[model samples]
Target: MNTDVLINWFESRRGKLTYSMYGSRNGSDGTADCSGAISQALKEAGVNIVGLPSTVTLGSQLANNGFYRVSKNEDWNGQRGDIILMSWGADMSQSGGAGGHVGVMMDSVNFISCDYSTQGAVGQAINTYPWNDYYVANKPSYIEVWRYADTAPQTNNQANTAVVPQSKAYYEANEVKYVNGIFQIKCDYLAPVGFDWGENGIPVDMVNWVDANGNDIPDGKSEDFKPGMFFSFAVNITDTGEGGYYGGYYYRRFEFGQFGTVWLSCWNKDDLVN
Candidate 1:
């Protein structure tokens, strides 16, 4: 049977299933207990089962049959119609795994169960449970995702989309290089990554000179006036106008936390003041 059919059967009759311990058949009085609701649904899906509200018994049966058992942490665990077996506590002398709590997957991240979030049958919320408020008493010690792989979904199209790196200009100056969502002077030049704009507008830069007041008064290359909190490099040799590959380094900070907002000025060996 299609997994969607299993969910649709219950959802269509959701209005009829007024949480009570008296539900045993489809379109019946409905269930207020944990396992009663699920047992009714499984019956509708053509699975013949009868007895107490023990989740482990039913869960293991499916796992021994068509359902693929996966831990909730596995990426494959979160599938629609997957049955979740949760351990509510550590009480022993049990038949199987705490006789804890049980829930079913609504999708990859959501679930629905009787007497789960509220007292009578529904409508309550929590601060930050596992599924939201799951930290309270009937807590889950472990979760099992019983996936119905017999009717799993299939992806029909090939994924061929490409991710284009965005571009940034330094004060609308030199053409900056963009790679891996980070903008830098060039492939040869490495700028730092993942820093926030401090209270001083500009944060620390590649060189070690720190300017905490958003002004370009650094200990290094502030030979002239501060150019809006410039990140300067001390005197260094660069390309000779004739033949060489080295360029002296200088970086300038110009704005807030814009991605490619740093200006880099490289002087050839011909422009040295020594």
Candidate 2:
């Protein structure tokens, strides 16, 4: 299945679809719940989904339909077009059965889902840390990441083999830049990766980060890591990788005002350049 096509199907419906269990499969009715939205997008992406399948069904059968669950040992930070299936109050074995939420990854750090309570409509949602109001209230008991079998990993995996800089003096001498200008960061490096879009270090709202054209910057795209990118606001840098938008183990959180938040890896030999 074309996951990019799948992501596009949802991105196109941002704020256009309402959350409703009785909504249409194609979202022609302007309403669709979580699973309904997934089913619709999958169908549009050429997945042979006959009807609106529940999160339980999709989570359990996704691998049977030409997709694979990502291994925890693998670098899952730059995954695009992957599906995140989450369940609350359940063990790993029962997590995908019921009381779960499903959404497609726009990138490893952000996901798009339809909901009435949290989002009010279909749009990009941050996979933030527990301090956020949502995660604090509705933390998932189990989570799984699944990807389309054909898509290749987006991060520079070879970067993983490089020696990571670790001297305290090296990092202390490294000044973190927050001024608005063209900044560049890579997708892989030796440092621990993560992000903070408010929640812990400082309070930042979870919003969509966009490019200069007001278009959402989908993850894993060439332009996502393009050098010399300018920002309209002060960029937030966190080396702790603790709370906020966690992307497995890399990055400094970026808040682009109304545009949104993006976390770029911080340990590349040439990362976080201005």
- TM-score, per-candidate, Cα-based: 0.42, 0.46
Query: Model 1, clash count?
Result: 6
Q: How large is the C-alpha RMSD of every model relative to the true structure?
A: 19.2, 16.6
Identify the candidate with maximal TM-score: 2
lDDT tens per residue, model 1, 1-274: 4567667655565444444444442334444455665666676676544644466566645533345455542335365777766654432113243255555666766666554355444322111123434524555555556655442122111110101121211111112333334333221121111111221122233322325432334344323223333232332222323321101112233332343243222232222111
Give the per-residue lDDT digits (tens) of candidate 2, residues 101-153: 77777765566666555454353221222122343466676666666644213
lDDT of 2 at 265: 36
Most lDDT-accurate candidate: 2
Off by over 4 Å in 2: 71-75, 91-98, 118-137, 151-274
